[model samples]
Target: MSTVGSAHNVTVLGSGETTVVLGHGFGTDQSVWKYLVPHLTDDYRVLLYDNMGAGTTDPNLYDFERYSSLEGHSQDLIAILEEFHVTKCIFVGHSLSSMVGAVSSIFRPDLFRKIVMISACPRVANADDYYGGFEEEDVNQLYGAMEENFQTMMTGYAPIVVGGDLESEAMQEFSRTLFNMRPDIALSICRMISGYDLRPYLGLVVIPCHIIQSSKDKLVPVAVAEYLHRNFGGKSVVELIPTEGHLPHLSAPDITIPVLIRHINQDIADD
Candidate 1:
């Protein structure tokens, strides 16, 4: 909490020269990175924090309109960088954080060394020429469900989003986090996430990117990964891990951590 940023709970780990920031997606917090930290701390200064509107975060800091879109969260990313005196760092962003990283990188290219996006999707709803995997009505119905019965919706939703057996602790952990957020806040956040489109900003990225796609994810499909690799502006590499769920780092750390390290090392070599 006392590490650097005042916006939210910020924890700094390791004292290495290079900085690495990990951003979690919707429904979870910084704790989502627990399984992967050991793989990183020895070689880099790591930054982890809960998203401002996440359940683990203070609801008072959340503004319904301000955080209604991903831009506000993107601003929070920049503030963390500035507060920590970080001019550049490797950004590892998952799910919604992927676009947050991209937006931050696009706005302030000098602050990012490279970006690693996991289970990223530029758009969730399909457009005429693009297959984002969800239909517009599907998103609308999801939001409606969240508004009507958040508790019940999350109970049935978390297992699907995180994948794995419904009885698994991993599924339970995700459910706990998902239920942490205020129902209204969660509704707003979901609306923002479901409605956002980062395809326009992909071409403006000046920093290199590595897209980590989960092969068996229900939320983000493999075609989305291919779309990112084919459309990303700067140099990029897309690797698909044969893992289930939208959170491979939590469910299959052994498979995800090694690939993450490899990408981090590759960024070092490139530098």
Candidate 2:
């Protein structure tokens, strides 16, 4: 049957009953989880998919009005899960996908046993009650840069968000995905996410969450992790990964994989 899963390039792997859905961030596709997928497929069912407008998906399928908000992506996730008949599993979401999974859980709580978010931020705009790292003007400047020289902005952006050695493979890998994105789609997605505020919906996530954050992520502050842990309606634990950068799975898998596995298995007994 032709489904959104086929259009989104969905693939399911592994032999175990416990499923793990790996959702990538913006400027990336399913390949962002390359380092962790092998470790997971051995013991658990692993599902991977590219979000709408990701480098891996057909840009022609991207509808600006349909994807004007994160809620649209959230609905896409639910449709994919329904297609696969995924009754319950661990949802691992990175960056923008973090809230994607969170919003999905609210609508189809039965489809998820737990949720895990890496480098997640519900809001990036600093407010009276929130510190989301970037100010309105700062994000506006970012939008300007992205719109002006998309390639240049990506080269500069990849290094800052990935951190560590500027010449590291991780930075290059991140840059590849960023560069692969169509300029208009990238800019629109960036603008949409930047202007969004998902904080009010935190109380709607019913599943337990495992929030993973690095000690120093240039893109996301550790304070956001703490904020999510407290703001979530159900049980959500924040784990401090012994690494830097926002994309720990791609950049620091050696340290992040073990920590991630530990958390994924933390409540196996309950499962």
Candidate 3:
């Protein structure tokens, strides 16, 4: 695909009627959509890109002070869409990018007609009455661990997050990606996402929406999805895929693909 600026090598598939921009989550690149796209390519154009620190992305583009927030990433999403002259489209974001879509939609309400947030959460921190499954201290500890022993932390993170065995190929892949990151960049991004508070404004999005949460997610809890459903009580669907882990699109697409295609095709039918 042609790029406007210093684009992270993004691949587009299925140049169909409507464009579907798929953004991968943290510690993952565009490859996470590999299985799900084949099911939708027949009817939609698919756009996939790596986040600032993922895949073949240039480290020079990463500005810790700027991109350390969801808002910065939202601007990146907008830039890509504008470069392509895409006004109306669907944004499918996994994990952290899921929240990124919300921030973008909230900011540029006209850009996206619909948004599909997979394995999503508004906030990952526990509040007074909220059960985010992770507290501020927990996040701090995570950063500390990542700073001290990234590889060991990753080996522990994958299984705990997905409830899968460390020997599983899926766990190994996730762990490998985490291990491959430059420790400094990884810690910076982690702190950014963990320190976010998207809850205050997620309700502002006035677009067709789908929140797909993994039932046994290690990072973003299912309760968080319910919180999203409660907050955005208008024209949104919140579904819990029974699989465990933070990366259902990568680890359990067998079950995720059908739910995803159903949403897309159903939207097509509505149109």
Candidate 4:
């Protein structure tokens, strides 16, 4: 199966030397890339699109069985690349979308030349000998809390991602987007991420990959970044941004934007 369905909403921005395909993660849509678009537009041809479960994807079009895994998302990305006739491009993926891009690079290396995985980790749950930043106990507590009080989880979770400053007026408004998701949808997405493990595919990834992690990411810690540097099979770089949130692009685009730009423009000599 090369593809399974039509595209949802795809937004393109840049027109530079490289074609950058942007994929947002769970709890958000393509709009999450708003901060980086402006800077990238001047340097790269950017392709932005929401996954089947997000944006204006018409929830009815989402296939529960097929759309439940990274392969399905990878298929959607491959379809988009084929639609655009994109032979090779730089994939910029956030959160779980990074996992999707990693899978795609292994499955469809002809479509991408390199990838930047922002706020990404192969596994969220701690394994027998793995340090994925978050242990099973922590994830259990989170799910238990969500099952018990979804709203309460948002109260603390939202502000913490919003830079933890709390006083900013935008925090409340920005949080509305995350809090508005149907609880069932959120639970399903969480379940998908918890069980997902892309580390085994790391060595199989042939493209030049970069893992961009937030310095103060309460969600995926720096240790997770270290793990990627050590385990991601292909040539991968780990860049740490000194931002105080999970979504540094949202909180500190000023720093996030440049790092991405330099990475896209990187060469073998630079590497």
Candidate 2 regions exceeding 4 Å error are: 268-271
Q: Which structure is stronger by TM-score: 2 or 3? A: 2
**Candidate 3 segments exceeding 4 Å error:** 1-6, 267-271
TM-score of each: 0.95, 0.95, 0.92, 0.89
lDDT of 1 by residue, 20-53 (tens): 9999998898898998888789989999877888
* Overall lDDT per candidate, in order of appearance: 0.85, 0.86, 0.77, 0.76
Measured over all alpha carbons after superposition, the RMSD of each candidate to the real structure, in angstroms, is: 2.0, 1.9, 2.4, 2.9
Q: Name the lDDT of candidate 1.
A: 0.85
lDDT per residue for candidate 2 within 137-163, as digits (tens), equals 988898998888887888788888888
| Consecutive 10-residue window with the lowest summed lDDT within model 4 | 1-10
The number of the candidate with the highest lDDT is: 2
How do the candidates rank by TM-score, highest first? Answer: 2, 1, 3, 4
Q: Whose TM-score is higher: candidate 1's or candidate 4's? A: 1
Residue 261 CA displacement from its true place in model 3, Å: 0.8
Candidate achieving higher lDDT, 2 or 3? 2
Q: Model 3, range 194-262, lDDT digits (tens) per residue? A: 889876786687677788877888787878888887787246777789887888777787898888877
* Residue 185, candidate 1: alpha-carbon lDDT: 87
Lowest-lDDT window of 10 residues in candidate 2? Answer: 262-271
